[PDB]
Amino acid sequence: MGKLSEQLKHCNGILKELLSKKHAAYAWPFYKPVDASALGLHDYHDIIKHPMDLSTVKRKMENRDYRDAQEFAADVRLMFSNCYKYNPPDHDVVAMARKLQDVFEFRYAKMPD
Ligand SMILES: CCC(=O)c1c[nH]c(C(=O)NC)c1
Structure with missing residues (x-):
């Protein structure tokens, strides 16, 4: 297969892992x-202009919306950035975001060339 296909298979593997029972304790938000x-977060859409979540990333992957790994990574990182922008940094959801981003960044780094 082509490089873009192989890289998107790696991305799909990461996505499956982020949605797996292994990470569920901190991934679920x-x-x-x-x-x-x-949730009573009536300021959320005033602060977050581009919401993103793993079900949306999964839909985009299933719909072949992502043309390359960089586009996939941009949505996953947008999801984490939204969490760091909206929430005070000492909130439980931020700790959960940091743990899931650690899983993401370390496996994303193993991208086949
Ligand atoms: C009621 C508080 C709450 O459930 C919440 C606060 N921040 C988030 C969040 O950023 N989720 C991605 C969820």
């Missing part, structure tokens, strides 16, 4: 779009 209204 990132599974679905933030329901701002339901």
